[model samples]
Target: LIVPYNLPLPGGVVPKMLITILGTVKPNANRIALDFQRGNDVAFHFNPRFNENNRRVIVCNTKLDNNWGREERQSVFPFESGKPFKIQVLVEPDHFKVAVNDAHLLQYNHRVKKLNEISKLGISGDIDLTSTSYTMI
Candidate 1:
């Protein structure tokens, strides 16, 4: 599912924000992504891959200026098959901070520096989402 975030805030902007996702991974799930986007560019791609790379892992990256940046993988894989999980992404001045199940995970520095241009949020893949929320900060 996809939704508009921080709608038309005096130029479609926000200094920072928080995104929360609640979902259950399917027993035979493969992957899922929570993306923050502006037009064709993705500021943050929070993707978790299941049963890949010899182990389940979360990969973070950015698509800016028509180029995909390096991936950041430092999470400990807190999600389980057929289980519910809460993931939070905090957009800061310089980086994106992520947490899973209330535990700190990893950070991805901003490649798309124009945070205000992040006008949409998206979620997709093999998982069933319970709910998702956005809070501008």
Candidate 2:
């Protein structure tokens, strides 16, 4: 999943933002999944223009497929502002793990686990991003 994030800036200044990414895979998806989770108050942004460049991608927060109501609920982390952080994930078969700045954060057991169904993914936060990227590992 390629999580996309955009922070709010009234003055148009590209200030750093804090954010998190989440997603689920279809049950029986033989394809591997990569789970990602950033540390406390960390944020990132994904350039919408990239959507035109990349075809296999999805972005979402903890929300309903329609992007409304309680479906947007997500886990929150409280940390000092201006702190820098990064997260990455790699999945194989049924196992998924997230790393923060190259350290392990958490592991998840996918119930759906389907490759095709895992098409929807999301990114949410408050900050500016220098750059973000995703690739199969």
Candidate 3:
């Protein structure tokens, strides 16, 4: 599987935009990370850890200047090992609304406010991406 899969966003992210990631969880997977970046800074980091010790947990945060911010963890896990999932991240002026497999997931408040400046999306680890796309409305 290709690692550190990076996609460019020429139009950038605007309010009401929706970013969708469709992928399969690797069997016995340990971690998966989806990051939205602006140059060298990661505007938002969405990560899911499936370490045996901590069976299921999703960690979300931001990173600026190589420094990571506090993480936000949500309890409900929709990812199952070896299964395919569709994650949708909806952009808003103040926050992001996320959905897993078409079901509501969680909201992450904007940490890096210049949404339009975030132009790259990076995905890595224990998952194989089938396709990634975005929509504007």
Candidate 4:
């Protein structure tokens, strides 16, 4: 997990407004990512495949994967830019529960059981951030 802190320096936290999630899932993992995602948006996405073009980037609103257009949504936080915000990703044995600012965000279901399915989980872009951490439960 990468954390950027520079309050009173610029954006009250990070300079950009983007969060990148990159990490490898444990091999033979059964419950890779199968959860709900209902953040600040009304629409929800499932089994979202993260690829080079689908990767999260700095911007407002959600980004959709062209591969699964209308089926899967890309990673992008929609909120008041230049403001402080936080993202919480809850990975479970069957799914993932994501929350932003303590509010429901989006849900993603696991497609592959192999831990290799998850290659990277990271957060990098532009925004104000106080602290960020990742833990396995």
Per-model TM-score, in order, reads 0.83, 0.42, 0.92, 0.42
Please provide, for model 4 over 39-58, each residue's C-alpha lDDT reduced to its tens digit, 9 standing for 90 to 100.
22211223322233645332
Order of candidate numbers by TM-score, starting with the best: 3, 1, 4, 2
RMSD of 1: 3.2
lDDT of 2 by residue, 1-137 (tens): 23244322222211122223323322322222222222221121121111224332222222223232221211222212354556554554554445555566454444333322343233433333344544432
Task: Select the stronger candidate by TM-score from 2 and 3.
Answer: 3
lDDT of 1 at 118: 76
**For candidate 1, lDDT tens digit of each residue in 1-137?**
33222222234335467778888877977887877787788888888888676788888888876888887875478887799999888777888888889999888887888878777777777777778777765
Q: Which whole-number lDDT from 0 to 100 does residue 80 have in model 4?
A: 43
Least lDDT summed over 10 consecutive residues: which range in candidate 4?
A: 6-15
lDDT of each: 0.76, 0.32, 0.87, 0.36
Give the better candidate number (1 or 4) by TM-score: 1
How many residue pairs clash in all the candidates, one count each? 0, 24, 0, 35
Residue 79 CA error for candidate 4 (Å)? 1.8
